[PDB]
Enzyme design. Structure first.
Site, PDB file in Angstrom:
ATOM      1  CB  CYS A 260      54.179  45.496  38.031  1.00  0.00           C
ATOM      2  SG  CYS A 260      52.428  45.366  38.490  1.00  0.00           S
TER       3      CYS A 260
ATOM      4  NE  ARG B 237      54.398  48.761  35.487  1.00  0.00           N
ATOM      5  CZ  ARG B 237      55.346  49.230  34.692  1.00  0.00           C
ATOM      6  NH1 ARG B 237      55.840  50.441  34.917  1.00  0.00           N
ATOM      7  NH2 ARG B 237      55.795  48.481  33.675  1.00  0.00           N
TER       8      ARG B 237
ATOM      9  CD1 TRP C  24      43.670  41.209  39.889  1.00  0.00           C
ATOM     10  CD2 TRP C  24      43.147  42.787  41.403  1.00  0.00           C
ATOM     11  NE1 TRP C  24      43.466  42.391  39.215  1.00  0.00           N
ATOM     12  CE2 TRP C  24      43.140  43.371  40.117  1.00  0.00           C
ATOM     13  CE3 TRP C  24      42.841  43.593  42.514  1.00  0.00           C
ATOM     14  CZ2 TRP C  24      42.846  44.722  39.910  1.00  0.00           C
ATOM     15  CZ3 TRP C  24      42.545  44.934  42.303  1.00  0.00           C
ATOM     16  CH2 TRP C  24      42.548  45.482  41.013  1.00  0.00           C
TER      17      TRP C  24
ATOM     18  CD  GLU D 124      50.712  36.542  39.197  1.00  0.00           C
ATOM     19  OE1 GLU D 124      51.657  36.804  39.966  1.00  0.00           O
ATOM     20  OE2 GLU D 124      49.624  37.151  39.202  1.00  0.00           O
TER      21      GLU D 124
END
Ligand code: HEM
Ligand code: HEM
Ligand code: XVZ
Ligand code: XVZ
Ligand code: H4B
Ligand code: H4B
Ligand code: ZN
Lengths: 410, 411
Positions: free
Chosen positions: A109, A112, A281, A286
């Site tokens: 991720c 973070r 969000w 992506e």
């Protein structure tokens, strides 16, 4: 044993000591690195108490009360509860800590830096799929916040014997349906063709469109899963337009504002939460790189390049590359116009570098999966490309788990 | 044992058995993955097992395993190791070994070409002047007036580690970099330290933005000596853009021939510390890394200025936009001058075909995803979606320390 990571753009070197508290496998050996493999392929009473002890030890260290009165009492209390009940229950405080640290430990991720701001919704009193639906509507509404997105997780009851699992059958709370056309092509999202079939097989009334928000398929207490439709007014969507190309509208593109992962398993103190939808969000790539331009997804590159009047005869004209940038400009532009939270890949990766430096300084490390952290476009002009990273598995953690239709005794 | 890799775009699953023949370490353990970490003499003792393994592989490849020729060669090499503490490769073994070090290079996306390597045996070289002659001929051959040809030149192997042949340049062709007293850099910032060595060794620097560095060559463990590649041998391409007339006025050019000269070639336990090899460029090496890294020529701003992009916030993707135009101009410029170059789309497509062929005929293809995936537009190339296994096979190319850190100067 006290490993070093180097940033080759800035020559900054950090020393990693947190990895010595790593636990589960990486999939790699001294003979073969599996760093690019997407998935390297109930707890008895013994297994459970050291996992509980390791977790409670780090929780009480974090609140400056390690080796203390309340620490020993809690360790003793949970031990008694495991000897007796063959499991135990987390205090609210431990559950919030465990969930924030599961995010903090997610090595794939990039977002973070926000890990400590997670809103944790304790749904451990839920008993039915209608209740799960209510919890999830409230999650979606809280998290969306009229476009000012807020990170959240909703935690349903933990696994018991293994036959009474709570599961959200959707991979994400909000996704578009996928349908096989008679002529052989695919309408909607090709990634969701199989799940859409189970929706129809369990009774969904599909409107066979291109951007149909899928219904929730919820499973409480190991029972049969039930269908629910998320109130349309709770699903914030963004029509995609371009700040230059007025013809971009005619592509008919839209996407939803809320990325919300619902098929993962949250491990805290050896306890397994099989239904724990979490949301944040979007990072713009992506949607614009993967969702829109993967050949196995909406795969719009060829259409966009034709409207841009690019030379599509030779790959070396970089027409795919040009259209790709423009698509991702439009996504960012669209969300930003409609005031929906979104982060571009330059801002997100710069934040992760600062997060890494914070974690190395104040924690001694930060497990990180370079293969996933580096964005799927413009890799080497983001700072993470030049950053060496060490990947290892810390607990509490989010883990993959089998898709429930391959597991459920129907 | 079996191991499976999946392509997530096509659902193709391949089965790796070649990883069973892997040898050295990856740097990883069951508890840490070092997949994104950039970096990590022999006695008669460990050498004959390494020689035997290599000769077995060589004689298998020629369908002569267990032959009298095979058994004789093993005996011959055994005795030569016992009496001389090392051994010499036959010409045929050297060529095989060099081709297979390329084939085993898990970071190289261009390996579909591995069997078409021109091997220049420079093992009879004795002086730095002789090294210079061999390297000029390699440069001329490989350049081929723009129709580039893969080549490698192999200088004498290591003996006791006190007599190494080394090419001190990391690449045969590179531009100088100069740190200015105001802290700015003229030329290639990556080459500032090596430029300073060359200057200290007596190179008279033009002090321009694109000055080809001189060769700094070490024979037989002696002090290195400076040599200027004949400029008529150094093929260069001025960079222009097919639509933007102002791009040429940025004053950019690049050399045509990528030639790595700081790596060590290991064949059958022998160590070739000087083994320059060359192919042709993939466009992104120049247009993405060389031109656009912050630590290199760093031209994104200038290009973005002259495109008049909205440069105030990054979410305009002005960097991504300028990056594409620059890489178009690199490909356009090389193609217009008929200098061999490959775009990252063609190169990654070819690599996937190569990888699938290697799994079929060889049982695997070790590959480093972190290096194989191009530094722009990663996921619109097919290697992004391909699972890869990384492991070390010999023969191999290895990193070695920079010689100025280890050399005992003669004076
Ligand atoms: C707040 C803003 C956030 C941003 C910008 C962000 C960004 C990202 C991105 C880009 C990925 C890669 C996903 C993919 O490529 O499919 C990812 C993965 C992931 N994120 Fe974050 N995320 C955010 C919030 C969160 C939160 C709140 C959690 C948990 C509480 C979380 C946990 C994870 C996990 C476990 C993965 C790996 C998913 C997988 O393996 O498929 N993220 N994130
Ligand atoms: C023929 C055309 C070739 C192409 C298109 C090609 C492509 C590439 C590229 C793009 C890289 C990454 C470079 C970097 O990022 O620094 C690379 C690395 C590499 N290539 Fe190839 N290459 C070619 C020829 C060769 C040859 C002839 C050899 C050896 C005989 C070779 C061996 C290697 C090795 C060992 C690496 C890793 C370098 C390192 O670790 O720094 N390549 N290749
Ligand atoms: C919390 C979170 C934030 C973020 N920024 N991103 C994600 C991943 C979201 C996501 C992934 C996939 C495929 C995962 N392999 C499909 C989706 F529909 C989806 F929303 C999650
Ligand atoms: C044989 C070969 C072919 C190719 N297509 N590419 C390369 C890499 C070439 C190269 C890399 C670097 C950076 C090394 N980290 C600097 C250079 F000057 C250079 F020529 C080598
Ligand atoms: C830290 C990271 O390993 C480093 O930046 C790597 C990433 N991938 C790369 N890939 C290629 N082809 N070349 C490189 O120099 C690098 N650098
Ligand atoms: C095979 C390869 O591991 C796969 O395509 C990965 C690569 N990196 C990724 N990175 C992110 N962020 N998300 C992904 O789905 C993937 N897919
Ligand atoms: Zn690894």
């Amino acid at each position: 044993r006290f490993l070093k990571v180097k940033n080759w753009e800035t020559d900054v070197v950090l020393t990693d000591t947190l990895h010595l508290k790593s636990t589960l496998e990486t999939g790699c050996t001294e003979h073969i690195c599996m760093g690019s493999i997407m998935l390297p392929s109930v707890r008895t009473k013994d297994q459970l108490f050291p996992l509980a002890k390791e977790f409670l030890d780090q929780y009480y260290s974090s609140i400056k009360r390690f080796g203390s009165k309340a620490h020993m009492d809690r360790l003793e209390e949970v031990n008694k509860e495991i000897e007796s009940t063959s499991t135990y229950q987390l205090k609210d405080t431990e559950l919030i800590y465990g969930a924030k640290h599961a995010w903090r430990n997610a090595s794939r991720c990039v977002g973070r830096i926000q890990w400590s701001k997670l809103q944790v919704f304790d749904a451990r009193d839920c008993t039915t799929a209608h209740g799960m639906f209510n919890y999830i509507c409230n999650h979606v509404k809280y998290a969306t916040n009229k476009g000012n997105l807020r990170s959240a997780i909703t935690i349903f009851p933990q696994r018991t014997d293994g036959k009474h699992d709570f599961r959200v059958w959707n991979s994400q709370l909000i996704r578009y349906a996928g349908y096989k056309q008679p002529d052989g092509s695919t309408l909607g999202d090709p990634a969701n063709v199989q799940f859409t079939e189970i929706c129809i097989q369990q009774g969904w009334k599909a409107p066979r469109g291109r951007f149909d928000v899928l219904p929730l398929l919820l499973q409480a207490n190991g029972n049969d899963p039930e269908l629910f439709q998320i109130p349309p007014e709770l699903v914030l969507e963004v029509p995609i337009r371009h700040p230059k190309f007025d013809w971009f509208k005619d592509l008919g593109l839209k996407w939803y504002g809320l990325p919300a992962v619902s098929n993962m398993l949250l491990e805290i103190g050896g306890l397994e939460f099989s239904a724990c939808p979490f949301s944040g969000w979007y990072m713009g790539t992506e949607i614009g790189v993967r969702d829109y331009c993967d050949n196995s997804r909406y795969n719009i590159l060829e259409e966009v390049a034709k409207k841009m009047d690019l030379d599509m005869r030779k790959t070396s004209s970089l027409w795919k590359d040009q259209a790709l940038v423009e698509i991702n400009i439009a996504v960012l532009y669209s969300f930003q116009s409609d005031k929906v939270t979104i982060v571009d890949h330059h801002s997100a990766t710069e934040s992760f570098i600062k997060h890494m430096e914070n974690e190395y300084r104040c924690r001694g490390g930060c497990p990180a999966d370079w293969v996933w952290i580096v964005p799927p476009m413009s890799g080497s002009i983001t700072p993470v490309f030049h950053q060496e990273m060490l990947n290892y598995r810390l607990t509490p953690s989010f883990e993959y788990q089998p898709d429930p239709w391959n597991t459920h005794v129907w």
